[PDB]
Design a protein around this ligand. Structure first.
Ligand SMILES: Nc1ncnc2c1ncn2[C@@H]1O[C@H](COP(=O)(O)OP(=O)(O)OP(=O)(O)O)[C@@H](O)[C@H]1O
Ligand SMILES: Nc1ncnc2c1ncn2[C@@H]1O[C@H](COP(=O)(O)OP(=O)(O)O)[C@@H](O)[C@H]1O
Ligand SMILES: [Mg+2]
Ligand SMILES: [Mg+2]
Lengths: 470, 489, 54, 467
């Protein structure tokens, strides 16, 4: 089909000249003669019937003049119920060594976004079981959740815990898109779900599909794996009227990969160094990941915050695309509170007394206010001394510290790290416990009793153990 | 055999930029139509080729595709038919309620009114927020910037204004009616849908036009959305009708313009923003004006929104918009989580128009409130450990905390000017100093109910007369004192 | 006698601490202005270099 | 003449190919076929008989191939005595809808600075009739003044008072060049000036000529508006031999417009992103505002400090050409002192004995200290108490309070509103009054006697009037 020839191989950007009709942009080009499959996606019509293409795999071995065919369609991936329990690449190739993925329906990774009249206006609440999330920044069923955080702050652990708590319980299928992450973590997740039962290698009851492009992959591949995963999720939303859970790790890699190829594509660098087409491409991806009126897709996306700078363009743009945001602060993790959710930075759209209820809203706002007042008091402490503050100031500091400790919750996925058994706190118990702490009913209990506990019943019980060991 | 005067061939298409050969008679900024059906705007009329930005996905456009001239600069449907309809940047309906019945198409590039046609802004544009209407007054025809960081309340401050306009708009009085236009630049379709749902629930859509340019929309659409909305608003202003436009995320429009310019190879500048970004924002905000009586007496109030990053008010786009606008309403996340909701920082927030945009009653109470609150800010540092301070300092701190509790207003609860005047009157005169700090908001609510139900005549006097006459002040004093005596139970 | 001396000394010490803080913030503000201008210049230079290389 | 053809229209950077003789740099090119007159200023000869030029109006609607004529000279503006009372844009056409500005001659905006021989070699004081300015921060005659302070500090009233004073005392007109002026604020300024009387519409009693460079205009127009106003002022200095006052608002916007124009022309930005030719552009503009043999143009330029950084390139470059600073402070406004000039903070470079006179320097230095020590001890009284001050410390408070009140002076422009006739105190009267207050001669007088008064005789007479 209009067999082209490679005219230049610079980095991942390969230019092909088509003597016959030029392939339209975003179509997939297959390089002939390579032992494996190398797919070149058209990016620009440079001119003189030449297309600038970004390779989806390594460009080593390419020789000028090599024949390149045109598929005629954007990269098409095997999609359907048969992808569950299978690991697939960006170009939809089985990488689990379990044979070909035999799906009767193929879909292209590139597609238009859902229309405005297809947007749903409902806002439910998803009880993850995490005290910080459910109280301060409640997640919503179908909403777009964002796990903002730096490096080594808890994004991967938190997302795996969310998979364990929600996805396992959720009857609908789930999709995990490992965009630009460590390959070791991908294998860990694959093995963990095998033993957990979410992926069954024997039967056909698997409930989670895996799309992985790790950082070992070339920049081009790392910029489309998210599109492949969301295409699979879209199939599980439109073709099948089911609720889906799309878990993507480090969406930031989607933006970063574009920055690694924009210069070769021929674009003038934008601020800091990202590609000029940052917001547009990010929206094109994100708008597709929504809950239409046909079906719901509750998406949890981990977003790496470069150098813990939220003002960085990549995390900054993604804030507008997410209904519920949970920012993991390194300073809190240094304090030891795990999860390291920043109580005064995390926000959710359903945090509305009409939606979450008056009591829930009041308790959450009280917690946030007391923590703000504690932040204010710390500056005074640094100069005056703790033994100089007023009794009201000391009471506020004590209660705020107790609340901060009670925010910490041991995770089942973190049982290996912390050593404590994982706990899941119901929303009612979370609200009741934080309300009691705000009231002061547990002021007599030491702060240590509130650290790494589940419900306040565990909190008071721990205090008694310490007294018995005193 | 191709004329290459009214038609052209795409030499290269990529990243939303099409370098078309031909089109020798294309006007600058003239919309053109591609073979695939996607429209385009001719921006760079380079000597050998015309650089036209694509209003859609580039998969449809290829090399050699015929590009034809529409023959006109971009114009959008403009009229009262748009009222209640969600449209895109080009004015095409997206709410699926049917085609717009607009009988007029106004160009989006029309220049702003000059020095002579305009007149001093006097008419108060009531936001409905106690803090804004009292300490940061906004007048019809004033460009007030709702600046702030992310998740601070910027959008909320604007939507409550649209909801508040229902009170006057439903009224028979025409001079007070204020049609509203909300321009969504970059917001996701889910967010826009939730916003329109809120407005419909408040029955505010009937006088509101929601122009949306979501993230999926191509960069040129996001670039043109504010101009289209402003042109839609100008209809009311040019025909003696008062209008309000809210350019939410004007920063995102600057980002889209930067993307277009850099991909068009226009020379970069600070933060890669093209040098003419100040011009881009100025030729939009200056269209907001209060025309004189001879020119209809209409108004086009503008409420741009700029998202500062970590309170960086010295960044390129923030500096530009701050310089252009007639004041700002700064919102701080610290206040938002400190109980001060809305998070309006009275100190940074300023209005160039000032008291001229306030009702005489609101002027009377608000001046005293402003002085007391400024003094409280001066002595606010002591408050932490100011128990051992001069009695004057203690009085300042108490009056400040009382006023701060007064200013707090619930979300999606726009208050009337008379009710705001009543509450501020209760505070400034000093009837709430004795009342416990936490009790202040409870008293505000209870007193609002009492005065609204029992004493609607007095509210009518403030509303109709427009000033606190001596008799009203005496009557207001009696009402407030009587209720305050019985309020505590 | 001791209490009056203590209070006077505390007042003087806090005043001196405030003066020292004022000097420090003056120096830090100068440094901040220099660094901000440098950052703007550096990003400008990076963008220009990227443009010219194309 | 030399009807060229547009070859490229990128933003406001139009490019024209002249088949006939190429127009020189800094030359106006009128575009034919446009309803609104669009002038193009030649910036670079790019070879191939084409000239890259910047547009002074909207560049929409231009078609590759449109014919443009060459004026043969830099942009020429209506220049004369009839520009007074009129608002003109950068190209010189009236924008006040009062008909054409029918002046006898026209002058090009781009002119060279006065030569070395023409420059005067003596520093002189331009007496403004305002006590605080004339005493603490005297305005140099032919120098550039920096009016720090935005709104709420009586900036507009101060400007109008300066116009009226220089018109009445020195018999010189003034030109207000608003670079990037908000349209609403321009209309407000116009109407306020009309009501004050500095510009009269009925008859030729106007004292100011307005040049508006409103923000909606392209960056090149805003960049050249200052030059337009400067040329209009240059008429009076050279042809009429008068002392003109050029009020350039936000010289920062002039700098920013220059930076934007350079960016559009593609010149590699300098540090912080300002134009590479910032210093030279500022020099070209300022150096024409000097004292020639025929006359002098003093410029009161409002200055904006980006990011509150005086070390920023634009503030630094502007300060290099400054000769005095006027800081309108909100605190002084709160005290009630109008004009709201901060006496201690306001500085002038002619405040040296060799220039001002030994008596003037002694008086200004004394009133400086008498207020500095009052401010310093103002903490002492605030902490301990007024009775806890020394006898002299009580005396200096009284005298300083008298001086800070005596600084306030009624302005004639606001006379209609305030009800108090404005005063034009001579420098000799200001010196005499302030030295008398310093000596303690009127220490018996009440403080209120010195508030909102003119000459010290008015102060003592008012003291008599009280009760
Ligand atoms: N007056 C108020 N009282 C209580 N809560 C409020 C108030 N105003 C806003 N909020 C809360 O603020 C949250 C977020 O506000 P909002 O989204 O309007 O702010 P924003 O700064 O415009 O955000 P973004 O820029 O992310 O769109 C909402 O969940 C809402 O409950
Ligand atoms: N409960 C917990 N939640 C999160 N992280 C924890 C917890 N307990 C211990 N940690 C440590 O914090 C680290 C978080 O790193 P991880 O989430 O894997 O990378 P990133 O934070 O970049 O996503 C873990 O590797 C673990 O060692
Ligand atoms: Mg990780
Ligand atoms: Mg918002």
């Amino acid at each position: 089909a209009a067999t082209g020839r490679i005219v230049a191989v610079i980095g991942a950007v390969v230019d092909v000249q088509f003597d016959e009709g030029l392939p339209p942009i975003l179509n997939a080009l297959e390089v002939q003669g390579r032992e494996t499959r190398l797919v070149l996606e058209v990016a620009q019509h440079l001119g003189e019937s030449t297309v600038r293409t970004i390779a989806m795999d390594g460009t080593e071995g390419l020789v000028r003049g090599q024949k390149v065919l045109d598929s005629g369609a954007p990269i098409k991936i095997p999609v359907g119920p048969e992808t569950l329990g299978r690991i697939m690449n960006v170009i939809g190739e089985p990488i689990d060594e379990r044979g070909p993925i035999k799906t009767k329906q193929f879909a292209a990774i590139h597609a238009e976004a859902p229309e405005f009249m297809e947007m749903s206006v409902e806002q439910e609440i998803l009880v993850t079981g995490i005290k910080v999330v459910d109280l301060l920044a409640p997640y919503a069923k179908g909403g777009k959740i964002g796990l903002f955080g730096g490096a080594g702050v808890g994004k991967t652990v938190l997302i795996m815990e969310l998979i364990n708590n929600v996805a396992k319980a959720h009857g609908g299928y789930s999709v995990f898109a490992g965009v630009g992450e460590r390959t070791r973590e991908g294998n860990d997740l694959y093995h963990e779900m095998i033993e957990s039962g979410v992926i069954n290698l024997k039967d056909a009851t698997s409930k989670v599909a895996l799309v992985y492009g790790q950082m070992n992959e070339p920049p081009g591949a790392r910029a489309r794996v998210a599109l492949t995963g969301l295409t699979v999720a879209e199939y599980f939303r439109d073709q099948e009227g089911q609720d889906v859970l799309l878990f993507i790790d480090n969406i930031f890699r989607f933006t970063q990969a574009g920055s690694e190829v924009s210069a070769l594509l021929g674009r003038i660098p934008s601020a800091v160094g990202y590609q000029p087409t940052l917001a547009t491409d990010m929206g094109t991806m994100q708008e597709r990941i929504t809950t239409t009126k046909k079906g719901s897709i509750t998406s949890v996306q981990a977003i790496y915050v470069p150098a813990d700078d939220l003002t960085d363009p990549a995390p900054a743009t993604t804030f507008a695309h997410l209904d519920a945001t949970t920012v993991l602060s390194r300073a809190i993790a240094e304090l030891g509170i795990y999860p390291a959710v920043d109580p005064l930075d995390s926000t959710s759209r359903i945090m509305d007394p009409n939606i979450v209820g008056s009591e829930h809203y009041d308790v959450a706002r009280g917690v946030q206010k007391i923590l703000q007042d504690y932040k204010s008091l710390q500056d005074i402490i640094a100069i005056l001394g703790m033994d100089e503050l007023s009794e009201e100031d000391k009471l506020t500091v004590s209660r705020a510290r107790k609340i901060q400790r009670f925010l910490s919750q041991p995770f089942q996925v973190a049982e290996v790290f912390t050593g404590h058994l994982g706990k899941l706190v119901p929303l009612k118990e979370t609200i009741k416990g934080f309300q009691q702490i705000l009231a002061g009913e547990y002021d007599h209990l030491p702060e240590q009793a509130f650290y790494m506990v589940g419900p306040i019943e565990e909190a008071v019980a721990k205090a008694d153990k310490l007294a018995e060991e005193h | 055999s191709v004329d290459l005067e009214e038609t052209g061939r795409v030499l290269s298409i990529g990243d939303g930029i099409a370098r078309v050969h031909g089109l020798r008679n294309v006007q600058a900024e003239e919309m053109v139509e591609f073979s695939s059906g996607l429209k385009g705007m001719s921006l760079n009329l380079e000597p050998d080729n015309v650089g036209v930005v694509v209003f859609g996905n580039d998969k449809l456009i290829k090399e050699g595709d015929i590009v034809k001239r529409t023959g006109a600069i971009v114009d959008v449907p403009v009229g009262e038919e748009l009222l209640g309809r969600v449209v895109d940047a080009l004015g095409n309906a997206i709410d699926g309620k049917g085609p717009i019945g607009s009988k007029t198409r106004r160009r989006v590039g029309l220049k702003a009114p000059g020095i002579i046609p305009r007149i001093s802004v006097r008419e108060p544009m009531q936001t409905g927020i106690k803090a804004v209407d009292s300490l940061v007054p906004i007048g019809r025809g004033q460009r007030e910037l709702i600046i702030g960081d992310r998740q601070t309340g910027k959008t909320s401050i604007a939507i409550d204004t649209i909801i508040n306009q229902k009170r006057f708009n439903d009224g028979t009085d025409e001079k007070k009616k204020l049609y509203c236009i909300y321009v969504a630049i970059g917001q996701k379709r889910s967010t826009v849908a939730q916003l329109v749902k809120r407005l419909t629930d408040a029955d505010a859509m009937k006088y509101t036009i929601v122009v949306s340019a979501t993230a999926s929309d191509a960069a040129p659409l996001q670039y043109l959305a504010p101009y289209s909305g402003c042109s839609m608003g100008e209809y009311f202003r040019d025909n003696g009708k008062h209008a309000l436009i809210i350019y939410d995320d004007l920063s995102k429009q600057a980002v889209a313009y930067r993307q277009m310019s850099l991909l068009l190879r226009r020379p970069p500048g600070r933060e890669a923003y093209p040098g003419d970004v100040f011009y881009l924002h100025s030729r939009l905000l200056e269209r907001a004006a209060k025309m004189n009586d001879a020119f209809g007496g209409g108004s086009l109030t503008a409420l741009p929104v700029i998202e500062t990053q970590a309170g960086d008010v010295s960044a390129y786009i923030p500096t530009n918009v701050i310089s252009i606008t007639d004041g700002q309403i700064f919102l701080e996340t610290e206040l938002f989580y400190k109980g001060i909701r809305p998070a309006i920082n009275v100190g940074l927030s300023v209005s160039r128009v000032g008291s001229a945009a306030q009702t005489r009653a609101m002027k009377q109470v608000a001046g005293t409130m402003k002085l007391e609150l400024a003094q409280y800010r001066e002595v606010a540092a002591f408050a932490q450990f100011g128990s051992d301070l001069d009695a004057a300092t203690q009085q300042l701190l108490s009056r400040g905390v009382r006023l701060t509790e007064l200013l707090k207003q619930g979300q999606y609860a726009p208050m009337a000017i008379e009710e705001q005047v009543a509450v501020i009157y209760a505070g400034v005169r000093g009837y709430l100093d004795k009342l416990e700090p936490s009790k202040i908001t409870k008293f505000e609510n209870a007193f609002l109910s009492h005065v609204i139900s029992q004493h609607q005549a007095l509210l009518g006097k403030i509303r109709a007369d427009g000033k606190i006459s001596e008799e009203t002040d005496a009557k207001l004093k009696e009402i407030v004192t009587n209720f305050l005596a019985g309020f505590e139970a | 006698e001791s209490t009056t001396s203590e209070q006077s000394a505390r007042m003087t010490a806090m005043d001196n601490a405030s003066k020292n803080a004022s000097e420090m913030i003056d120096k830090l503000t100068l440094t901040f202005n220099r660094t901000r201008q440098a950052v703007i210049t550096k990003e400008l230079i990076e963008i220009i270099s990227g443009a010219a290389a194309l």
